[PDB]
Structure formats: structure tokens, C-alpha cells
Amino acid sequence: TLRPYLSAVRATLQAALCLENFSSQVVERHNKPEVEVRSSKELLLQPVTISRNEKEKVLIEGSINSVRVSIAVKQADEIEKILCHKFMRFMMMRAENFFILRRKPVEGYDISFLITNFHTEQMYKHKLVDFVIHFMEEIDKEISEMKLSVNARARIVAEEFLKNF
Amino acid sequence: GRLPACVVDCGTGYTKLGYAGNTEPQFIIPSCIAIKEVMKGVDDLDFFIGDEAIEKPTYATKWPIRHGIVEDWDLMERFMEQVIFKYLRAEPEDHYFLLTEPPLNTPENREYTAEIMFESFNVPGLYIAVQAVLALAASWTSRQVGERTLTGTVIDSGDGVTHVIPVAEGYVIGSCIKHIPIAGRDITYFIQQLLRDREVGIPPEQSLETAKAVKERYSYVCPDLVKEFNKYDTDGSKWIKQYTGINAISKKEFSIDVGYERFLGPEIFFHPEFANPDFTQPISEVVDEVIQNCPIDVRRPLYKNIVLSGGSTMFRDFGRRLQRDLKRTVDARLKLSEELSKPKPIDVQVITHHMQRYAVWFGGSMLASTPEFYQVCHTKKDYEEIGPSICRHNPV
Amino acid sequence: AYHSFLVEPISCHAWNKDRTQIAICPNNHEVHIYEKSGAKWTKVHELKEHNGQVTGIDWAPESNRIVTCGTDRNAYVWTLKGRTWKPTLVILRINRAARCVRWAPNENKFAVGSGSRVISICYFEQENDWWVCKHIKKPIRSTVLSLDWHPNNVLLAAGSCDFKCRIFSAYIKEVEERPAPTPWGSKMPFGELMFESSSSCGWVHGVCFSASGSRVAWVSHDSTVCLADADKKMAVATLASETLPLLALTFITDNSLVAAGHDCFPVLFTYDAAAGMLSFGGRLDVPAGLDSLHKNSVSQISVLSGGKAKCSQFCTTGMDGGMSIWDVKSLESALKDLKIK
Amino acid sequence: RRVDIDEFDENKAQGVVLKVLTNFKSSEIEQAVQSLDRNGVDLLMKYIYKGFEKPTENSSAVLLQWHEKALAVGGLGSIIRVLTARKTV
Amino acid sequence: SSLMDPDTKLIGNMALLPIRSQFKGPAPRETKDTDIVDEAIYYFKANVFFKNYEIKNEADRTLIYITLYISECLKKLQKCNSKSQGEKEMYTLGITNFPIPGEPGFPLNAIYAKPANKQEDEVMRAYLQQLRQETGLRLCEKVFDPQNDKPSKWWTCFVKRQFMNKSLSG
Amino acid sequence: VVCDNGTGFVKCGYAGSNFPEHIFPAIDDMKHLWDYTFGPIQAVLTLYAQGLLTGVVVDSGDGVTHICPVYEGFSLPHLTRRLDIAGRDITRYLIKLLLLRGYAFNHSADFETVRMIKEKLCYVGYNIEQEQKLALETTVLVESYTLPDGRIIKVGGERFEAPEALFQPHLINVEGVGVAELLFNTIQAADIDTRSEFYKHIVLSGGSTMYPGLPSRLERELKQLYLERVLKGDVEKLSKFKIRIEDPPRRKHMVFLGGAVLADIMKDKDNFWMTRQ
Amino acid sequence: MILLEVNNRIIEETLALKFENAAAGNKPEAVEVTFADFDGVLYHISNPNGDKTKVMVSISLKFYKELQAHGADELLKRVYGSFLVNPESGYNVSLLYDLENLPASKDSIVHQAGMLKRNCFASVFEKYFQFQEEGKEGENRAVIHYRDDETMYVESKKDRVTVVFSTVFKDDDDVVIGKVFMQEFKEGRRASHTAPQVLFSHREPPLELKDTDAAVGDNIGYITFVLFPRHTNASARDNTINLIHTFRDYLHYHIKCSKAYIHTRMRAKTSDFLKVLNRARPDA
Ligand SMILES: Nc1ncnc2c1ncn2[C@@H]1O[C@H](COP(=O)(O)OP(=O)(O)OP(=O)(O)O)[C@@H](O)[C@H]1O
Ligand SMILES: Nc1ncnc2c1ncn2[C@@H]1O[C@H](COP(=O)(O)OP(=O)(O)OP(=O)(O)O)[C@@H](O)[C@H]1O
């Protein structure tokens, strides 16, 4: 059931993202996203969650012009935890050129997607949904290969040293 | 504070390694890497830098340190691996490193470099200074100065693109730098073609190294060309020499003449029109144009100290003629002044010393053997507490 | 039929009275008037005055005027002086971005809705040569989103973010004389609240009166659409959408409606007044990587052909430079599930 | 710089649903979801966003199948009525 | 200045330069034994690698004419195997004519003042004959070694080096 | 006819116009200004431009900042104070921000290029901590720019920090105020008669008011200070309190413009000036 | 590389230059090169007291108090001999080469100036290879601190020798990766059954040395080496001590290398997502 889990997410992100331009109700002449500053209560939508198990959960927090989507990542053991934590902290250094994310995730969550109105304009917003799915598609497998990378390359390193005695 | 600190100084063509306190580096290795034609384990360790990289015909020789910037990180990263555990043998958790970088690098490219040292090498310190400042820090020991000053002019003479920088209070000025595509490499091509046309019997497939050493062992700045050709014709003795090339293929010795490519070799800095019609502008005033862009207050300090850098200023009295070449420049522009107009004439001095072969690295042993360097390093906890924005900038 | 202009999102579209020229701003300081030259489009005018973005425009079809509203709290009236259009300084006594604007059919006053929970109404005085702003403050509590006029030049619809479609009374008494009575109520002064909607669900994105102005309808953010009557005494009827979020909607007779949204293909509507039923039609259409010709959502619907009553041609402009022009009689043929009353 | 005055201005049952759905098997979703009216789906729509917010041992697995049949019936606008309800249950 | 004085006058694109020649007598005449074409060989190798020589004078019009003349002569003494074989190929090129000012087929016509009459062009041909005469016998002792039939390699290394990238004949 | 000769920017023009019809600065040294000029208080002019009598002026331009209480006809001179924070010192602070971001700039040569960035990218924040949850947390503030030598830098968290650190007496080395503080000091130094008159009669004038949201911070900080020192903690008595702060659209070209409404011109003006009486 | 350099490439380039100056008869030069290596080892090569023909190697440590009581001076005074002189001020051992007394084939002492830290760890091993091969048990175990927190524990047994590193994994991420290297080190005899077998535990010292003050901590694992006489016989002392005296530094290598392998794999992948994000961005 790994496939239909992404489907309902794909079935929710499309519903999530139908936005517009909207200036600040609070401040003169500004345009700041609503799901971050949270100063106008009535605009913020109801935060929803979709999960497959105790762990694989995705939060969506909608507003009038921005949606903060966050993702829990499957962390099977401690050796993948540093594989989880670096792979995040690699890309979170690089959210300036790769620039639709947050720098620091939600407390309890692993990475936070922040799509404004402008990012729905200069990009095809029926495919930014598909990119968010694509990011969850292969980091299941991306970390899965690097475990098999390390458990192979130690075996190359060790067998050389021990036969040399 | 008892075991000293590495100063890895990755130049354009030649990497300059070495530990602190040292007059000269323990390596002068060509900045190049051989890599196999992704690769895993034993496939992903076969890394060979420098001298074996030029040697090995099996693997290709990438030069990722190109124009001073990094072409690609994942091959730069392997070069920073085996610059430590194979040639420096330093303790990777116990030295406050000092990487170095050419001017106008983006402050993304700092946090690409500083990331890997704090996340694949666990270094206890790091301080990525610019090449220009620690260049002129080397000339503080010179007898041409008596007082310390960190404001003046450096003349980088690199291998990909030479630069010119005015510097002020320990900070480069990103407005006034100028690419000039003369280099160390441009002198190689045409004097190789100058011995294609006069010497007979040199195999073409190694003639660049052949052209290299005669530039190394026999070049000199000629002071003035029009008297110079007669001094070969009047005197065939004390100007004509003979170079003894070793045939790397056919295993022999071949003698070649040391003739006219001596004096024109360094002279193309004084006129670029000898080898390129892309620049009609000599070096005698293009540094003065870079001078004439900075504000009015900083120019009068900027005349007193022009500093030579890089290996491509290892030619006999290169500073002497170019001193006169700037005195012809600046006095003619104030010759406009007194006519129309009163301001005092200003002295201009260039700087030379012994280690100007590699005076970029020699600044690294004036810093890492001082306690103030231990004050200003990024510690490892500073990356872990606050994030890469502390290491995206540089301290003083 | 589909022309496309640009990559930028255009704010809103309007036409001349013959419905030939069009005027839009594609996400900039500059609203551009375009015009057919056969099947060829001509950038006939450019407007460079607003120091902020602009958000809503209406061409005055009869006085040849152009109203603006934007985000630098400034609204400018553009009237044709020969070839070069000239602005007009209009102070609304509000401080932030406006949202939408449209002329009353007398062309004597225009309604601006904005973020300071008030609606500024400028009607033109003649001695000072001035558009005096007068305000409808109570009980609007949120940012006003969409507006619509009754054809009597007296009433004024209002839709904001407090979910409550509060239809009003804004009879200006000094440039207009005492109008006829209205099936809402009797006394109509300025600022007179008349009826607050029963909608506590979904934002109020688009409102419109009918050609009578006795009927009024609105679509909501929660995929619903609701209509009420002045003749049937404020009776709000309820209908939920089973499609996608939606913005714009318009009448075509007095009880027949057409609305499109974030799919940019329509799906008609008719108000069954006999059974009291808002019943959603059926796309009435017939079928990058997209079935609809235009890429982004709708931003506006408006009728090319002779008012909202006739009612045949209508175009769809959205958050991209394309226009899909749609004729009703062009759509009458191939559809097998349409409903028209 | 130390106080919030953005608010002080002069303007502007649960455990029953999870118990039945997890006891309802996966094969009878089509007979359970489609038996409700236009308002019963949106009533069921807020139900599915309860156990997905508060998971248990056997909660989040089968309710994705419960989200599946209600997706096609509810369409795409049925989800908004979770988002936009400023007073909800 | 060094190649120009108001005592001599501008006839043609250049001023008629005071020669010292193979013969003595009535000619444009100078005091010192050093000639312009001596100087056109003396400061030759300091001028051979430029791209755009300055104009301080009209004697440069002569001076780069000799340069393109030597640019022809370097193509000839690539193939020479004795001093007599070199001179007869220089007597060959010293007689054979190429176009000279404002003339099609001759490059750089935009620089030179063109004499329009029939008179001054012929006198220029009578002077450019002397340019083709007086240069070649001074190239005998200066290209070849004092041990005869030994072409010096210090004139070989200009065979690809030109004033600019033009072909002289085509 | 009106003449307008300034300190850091000098104007000229005719009567009944829309703008200063030419602009050029003043290069003893003001006595030579008459040569290129004839060839083609401010606050009373500023108030009557908006068309009022007694109010509060936020005069924030280039060289120095004034705050002016001014009555119907005359000013309030002893009430009208003058600060010493300028507009340039914002830019001088803004370099050091971007320098610690990592971009090389000199304070002398690179001066005007940063001044372009300030007038395009930089603004003010209503609060600091919710604002600083955008630099450390989110992408949004990061916006591109292009240098005139062709380089493209990105500025994120150093946009909103134009005003803040030299309001503190450390970075300015001067014990002083914020911005609403000396504002609030002056009204409570003023009368009680026209006190609530003042809090709906605040005008902003100058190019150093072009920061968006600056009338959203002055409204927020005065709700501290009137709660602090005057009303001393009460809830609903603060809800009565009138706050209206004004800023004209054409205010940057208004000082010469507003005088045209007062300027009841004559047949003669030469007959009083002492070199031409 | 895959095996480290028991060679010392910071001298083997240096003095190999130096004798060829005298072999060409050139005048020697003022050389003073001061530099380091693994494990806190400091070097100093200089002309001693002002003559350019005299070339002095000089090494400082902190172990010579703990090491000299384990038979140090029998080894290197035998091997180096008249090369070895009085220790220089501030230095434990000080060798000396004079370039007026060059040997015949210089590629020996150039090579045998590169074992200069290797010859100090050998003598404590050579002392305790005697005690195994002659059965003389009842011996105190050598407790040798080779850093501030890095202690060496040897053990002579009946038919074997075991030896123990007291490693400290100073960061937090290295520990989790570092435990995976001892897995295949525990699985070393899947095809290499002639290999010296290794035990490992983390944070818990071995019970054989539980009587000591052996610490307990998150940074610390304990690594053994079962040494049969088949690898410590008289034929292969010198092979075995070359491998074993760098194994702490060897394991610092492939931890950092396997970190480096991630940042080349992952930097490729951040270009892949940034590719796909530019495709939904329009061609226009
Ligand atoms: N005595 C010499 N004679 C001739 N050429 C020399 C001499 N010394 C050095 N060079 C030349 O100088 C070049 C080295 O320049 P440089 O030291 O600037 O390289 P780099 O350190 O890699 O560059 P950079 O420091 O600018 O990044 C070499 O290519 C060499 O050919
Ligand atoms: N659009 C803008 N955004 C931000 N700052 C601006 C803008 N326009 C001008 N400024 C700032 O305003 C200052 C000048 O404004 P102003 O014209 O009010 O002062 P000034 O009249 O020149 O000074 P003085 O009164 O001394 O003549 C400049 O220093 C500039 O930094």
C-alpha cells in the first residue's frame, strides 16, 4: 500500500493549491505569506494530516496564499538517522538556489515545503504538485542505496587489510 | 597550541601545501588529478594527484582548479582527501586548517568548501582567507618595508587568468578587478611555436615541457628591444647559450640553441600585441586604470606598495622596468595637470623579495604561527550551533 | 478560439461598449489596452503611473473612462484625451491595497473594496471637480473581495472575508434623486445595511446581481454557490460544487448562470425558481499537458454580447496571457447535458 | 519591542468514529461511503482527518482505502470543506 | 622627425626620402651612410610583431612598404642554396612589379595619398625601382653569414610572422 | 512665484505648477547658486499641502530627521526637536549587514549601488521576532538583484534590518530614542488641549519615509507608549484612543507643490528686495 | 590510499634531494623544516648549530618516559648506530647524518629515515614477542598513553598475543558509522581464516582489563588483535608491526572517506531534483 499513500497525498495537494495574490490585512503595502506570520486568524485553513502508519505522516497547513507542507521520513534505524539528518541538512543549506523549501523543519517533522503565490505563477502549478510527490518517490530509495553502498564498501576496505598480515 | 597548523594553498596550476612555521612548502605539486574513466569502493579510491597524474596514461587528467574557481566539487573533494592522509599525514581532527581562495568567489562557494571540512574531516578549525590579503602579508618581512601596512596593490600572475587587485584595510575591492587573459600559460604556446620554426629534431609530443624549461632556466626581461637585437649580432658569445634537451623518446640527448625566445618571453607583459590583437593596452597603464577607478583618498597610499605574486613574476628585474613603466605613465598624466593649472609628484614603488616564487603560501606561515589565528577560527561547535552562515563569511 | 499574450498573469479584463478593444495588466505597473485588427492584436495603449501593482480595472463603456485600483493605496481615473490617456487623482481615504472596482451603470460613482474593512464610494462633485469618497463601514469586518451593482444605480453588493455577503444601500442623495422603491425594503439612505447573507462557510469570491437586480448570486471558496432573491424576500438558496475551487460567475438570463474556476473550463447553472433549486449544470463544454486551452485558472468572466441578458459571447481571462473566447450558441450544439432557462 | 498588540486593536464522539471504521473491514467501503447524501460525504470527510491526525495501531493503513472511494465520490472540492470551516467539529 | 624634415618635401603618399645609393650623383641625398632602408632593417625586428603601427609621419608609408617588401623577400630566401642563387631570385623580384597608392590588388589603400597624374606615379615607380634595387644587395651580407652560402637562422624565424593576416598576391 | 533652495537637494519652479520644474543641487558657495537658477517654514507648507492647521510632522529626509509640532499659523519651535539619525547611516549600516553576509563592499566607492538596493528592496517590520522567523526559517525574503558590473547577488535576511540596531544606543553610540519614542515624548511635552488632535494628525514627509509598513510600526509602538507612561496599563481606555497617521501619495514633490495653494501672487515682487527695491 | 604510508613522504622527498646536492658536489643549503605526522608526533630537521653539511633529524614525543622502560635503546642504537647521537634540547631521540660520509647506496638510509616513528613502537612489541615465544608469563601489561585519551593495552598469553586500542570517537555522528566498520572486522574470517582475529565492544572495557581504570563512554570502543605465533614468528616481526601501529589512524581514514562518498553521491542528486524543478518552470 505504498503507492496509494502517495495517491491520497497527490489527491490532497491538488486540492490544497488553488491560491491567489492577497496583500496584508495587518500591514500597509506588504505581501507576506499567511501560514508563517499567522497574525490574521480567520484566513488560515484547518491543518490536516495524512499517514500510512505510525510514522509516514504528512502535514498540510493551508491559507489564502501559502501552504506549509511538511513530511515525516521513514527512519528505520540509527545508521539511517544520520543518513536522514545529513541528507536533510545538506539540502537545507541549499534552499537558496533550490528555493521552495524552509530552512528549518517543523519540530517533529523532517522537511517543510513552503509554496507561495509567486511560485504558483512562474511555474506550472499542476506540476509543482507532481514535484512534491517526486521528492517523496525516491528518497525512500536514495537512502536505501546508500546503506547498500556503505555495507559494500566496508567489505572492500576490510578484506584488503586483513589478508596483508 | 603545540602542534602546528596546515596551510593548504590551492593555486591555479600549482598547489602549495605545507605546515606552519616553515619558510618554504614541503610540496610544490601540480594542481591536477588523475581519475578513472558510478564507481564504487576499490573503483572509487583510485585517485592520483600531481606528479603521478601527469605520468599515468591510463586515466584522464582533469584540472578542476580552473580560472581560480572550482569547476566541479566531487572531483575537488577527492583532491582534498588525499592532500591530507597521503602527503601531509596531518591529524585530521587536530589542526586549524587554512584553505585559500582567489578574489570574486561567490559566498555560496565558501559554504560549499567549508561544509566538507566540517562534515567529512571533523577539523577543529578553519579560516578560508582570500589569496590577495595573505599575498601581501608575505612582504612584511621584506627589507623594503619597515612598518606593517595592509593596504596597497598586489599583482597576481597566475596560470589561468592573471588578476590585478587594489586592497584596502584587509578587504578586496570588487569594483575594480580586471581579467587580463595573459598568464603563465600564454608564454608557453608561442615560444614553443618559436622553437617549432628554428630548432629541428624536437619531437612535438613533449615539446611543451621542452619549451617550459628553457623559459625556466634562461628567460629574462629585456629592458629595451631596439638595442637588444644588436647585442646578439654584436656579441654572439655572452648572449647565445645552448640548452641540452634530453630525448624522453629515443632516450638520447639533443642540444638546442638558446636564442631569441629568451628576451621576448617576459616582454609580452609589457606589450600584449606580440601574441594577441585582443589587447592593445600595455600593463604600464592598465594597472593605473585600476588605480584611477578607486576613490580620491585611497590613491596616494596605493602608489607606495605594489606587490608581486605568483610564479609568473620570476623574471630578472621584472619589477625594475615596470616601475619605470608606471613612472612614465603617472608622470605624463600629471603632465596634463601643471599645464592646465599645485600638486607634488608622487613616488611609486614595486615590491620584490626571495619567496615571490610562492609568496602566496609564505603569508600562511606568518599567520598560522601566531596566537591571533587561534582567536579567529571557526570552531566546530560554531558550525553546529548556528549554521553555515557563520562560515559563509570570513573574519578579519 | 484562443489568443495568448504573455507569460505573466493578467489581473482583470474589460471591453469597450462594442466589445472590440480589451485592456489588461499582466502583473506589472502597466495596464495595456489591446484591440483586434482582424485576427491580429494591437498594443494600442500603455499606462505608466502607479508606483505599486494594479489589481482591478474597468473600462467605462459610455464615458470612455478607465478606473484603476491596486496596491499602492491609489486609484486613478483614466479618460481619453485625444490619443494620450490622462490620469485623475482620486483619494479614497484608505491606507492599503484595494481589491476590485466597477462602475455603476450611471457612470457617476464607482465602488472600491479593500482591506480596511470599509468600502470607499467616490461620486463626482462638480464645483470642486472632485470625486468625494464616502464610506460604508459597518458592519464590514474583513477585506472586501468582489462587488456588483444593481442596475438602478442605487444598491451595491459587497463580499468580504468574513463569509457574509452583505448587500447594501448606497443612494447618494445629492447627485441622484429619490429612486423607485425596491423589493428589499423602503428607505434607502447612504450606508444603509439591507441584508446580510446566511453564509458562515467559504470566502466570498464573486457576487453578481441579475439583469433585474432582484436576483443576486455568489460562489464560495468551499466549492459552493448560493443565490437569493429580492422578490422572494431574501431567500438564500444553497448549492454545493462537486468540482474544483472557483472564482468567477455571471448570469445569462435572470435565472441562468455560468461559472468557471481553477479548471478553466465552464459548467453552466440555472436557478429553478419553481422548485426553489440551484441545480448545477454540466460543464457545457466538450473535450502544459492540459485539456483546457488556457493554462492557469480563471480570474474573471464577462459578456461580449449585449449585456448579461441576451446573451451569447463571453471570454475567460485568468492568471496567464491567454484568452479563451466562448460563444453560447457555439456551445449549444455539441453538449448533450446542458440546461437553459 | 516586547509585547503583542496585533490583537488588542478595535477592528475585526471522537473515539466513536475511530472505533467503528477500524472495525469496519476494507471490503465494504463502497457500500458504506456511497450510502450518504451530499452532506454525509463532507461529514465523513472530516472523520477521515481525525485518525490520520491521531494514529493508533491499526488506524492509518486501511483508512487510505477509506480515503480512496470517498475521493471519487467527494470529488476534489469536498476536501476544502475541511479547510475553510472556521467552526468545525 | 627622425624620418621627416621640412627640407624634404611630400611628393606622393610619402616624402621623397634622402637616399644614399649604389651610385653617387643627382638624387635625394643624405649626409650619413645610414639609410631609411638600413633603418628599415635596423629597427625591423623590433617592429615585426605589431598589428597597428602609429602614424607620426608619412615615411611610415615607405617604412611598411619595405616591411611588405621584406615579407615578400622572406618567402624567397626560404628557397635559396647559394649567394648567387639568392641574388638572381632577388633580381627576379626586384624587376617584377606589384601594385603600389590607392590601387586595387594592393592592400591598405585607405592610408596612402594617391598621385592622380601620370607624372608622379612614374617617378614613384622610378623611386620604388630604387627601393627594389638598393635593398637586396644590402640583404646579401645581412641574411647570409660572413662564411658565404650560410643563411643565418636569425632571419628564418620570421617566415610565418607577418605584419597582419593579409595575402600579398591573390 | 515660489523659490525653494535646499540643503541636501535644491529646487526651483514657477507658481501654479505640479512639480519643481527643474532640479539641480547647490554646488559663498550658496551665493553662486543664483547663476544657474534664474536660467531655466516648510512644515506649514507641508500641513497646508494636506490642508490642515495643527499636526505632527515626520520630516525624515537625507541629512537629518526633524519632528515638527506646528500650530495653525505659526510653528511650535521649542516643541519642534531635531534628531541626528540620518538616511545615509541606514545605508552605512546596510553595507555592514551584507558584508557579514559575505559580499565585498567599500564604504566609499560602492556607495550609490547599495543606495539602489535600499530604495528597492529594504523596508521595516512591525515586530522583530516574528520577522526573524523568516530569515532563519523560510526562503521568502531572498530576492535577486543585479550589480552594474554584471554580478547577481541574493539578499535575504538583511532586508528588514534597515532601522533597528542604531535605535539602540550601542550601534549609534548615542543615547536616544527609537522613532515613535521621541514622537511620544514630544506630544507629552506638548499640551493636553490638542493632545488627541495630534494622534490623528501625523504626517510623514521625505524620501526616508518610503519604506512600506512604516505607518504600520508607528501605530504599533504608540500602543505601547501611551499604554506605558500615560494610561499605565488599562485595557478599554486604550480602546478609545484615536490613532491616524498620514502619508501623501505625491509627498516627495509636495513641499514646492503645497505652497502653490497659499501663493496669492501679485503684479509685483521686485519692490521689496533690497538690491532691487 | 587503501593501505597507508609507513613511508614518510615529508622526509623521503627531502633528504633524497639533499644527498644528490653532495653527489653533484653542490654546496649544501640552509635547511630547517619543522613539521608533524600522526598521533602528536612532531619532527624537526635542521642543520645542527650552523653547518650545512651536517643534517640532523630530531623527534619529540611524550611517550619516551613510558616507552624507554620496555627495551627501546637495544633496537635503534643497534640499527642506526653512529648515526644516532645525543638527543637535541627538547627532543627524545635525535639522529644525525653528515653529508661528508655518504654511504654506497643511499636508498637504504633514505628509506630507513622514514621508519623513524615506526622504530619506537617496535621495541615494546619486540620485548613482548620474546615473552610469548619463551613462555615467560606473569608479566605486567603495558599501559601506554599514545594521546591524551588514547591508551595502549598489550597482552601476552600462552599461545597468542592480544593487544587493545583505547579509541575515542570525538564527534557524535562518527560513532554510528564507526560501529559498522567493526562488523566486517568481526566478519573478517568469511574468506580470510589466516587473518589475525579481532573482537570488539563499545563503551564496555574487556573484563581481562576490568581491574584497571579503563573508562566508560559514548566515544569509546575497544578493539582486540588475536596474534598467533604464525604472524609474530621470527620471519614476520617486521611485517606485522608495520600494519598494526597505524590501525587507529587507518580507521580514522575510511570513516572520513565514507563520509566523503556521501557528499559526492548526494551532490549529484541535488542537481537531479533541481533539474526537474526547472522543467515545470516554462521554456518561456
Ligand atoms: N623562474 C621561472 N622562469 C620561468 N617561469 C616560471 C619561473 N618560476 C615560475 N614560473 C612559471 O610560473 C607559473 C606559476 O604561476 P603561479 O605560481 O601563479 O601558479 P599558481 O600558484 O597555480 O597560480 P595562482 O597562485 O595564481 O592560483 C608556472 O607555470 C611557471 O611556468
Ligand atoms: N524610494 C525610496 N525608498 C527608500 N528610500 C528612499 C527612496 N527615495 C529616497 N529615499 C531616501 O531619501 C533620502 C532623500 O530624501 P529627501 O529628498 O526627502 O531628502 P532631501 O530633501 O534630499 O534632503 P535635504 O532635506 O537635506 O535636501 C535619500 O537619502 C534616500 O536614501
Author numbering:
A (entry chain F): 4 to 168
B (entry chain A): 3 to 39, 51 to 354, 359 to 413
C (entry chain C): 2 to 288, 319 to 372
D (entry chain G): 12 to 23, 75 to 151
E (entry chain E): 6 to 175
F (entry chain B): 9 to 35, 83 to 95, 140 to 376
G (entry chain D): 1 to 284
Tell me, in the authors' exact words, what the paper reports.
The Arp2/3 complex regulates many cellular processes by stimulating formation of branched actin filament networks. The Arp2/3 complex is evolutionarily conserved and built from two actin related proteins (Arp2 and Arp3) and five other protein subunits (ARPC1-5). When activated by a nucleation-promoting factor such as WAVE or WASP, the Arp2/3 complex is unique in its ability to assemble branched actin networks by stimulating new filament growth from the side of existing actin filaments. However, in mammals, Arp3, ARPC1 and ARPC5 are present as two isoforms – Arp3, Arp3B, ARPC1A, ARPC1B, ARPC5 and ARPC5L – that share 91, 67 and 67% sequence identity, respectively.
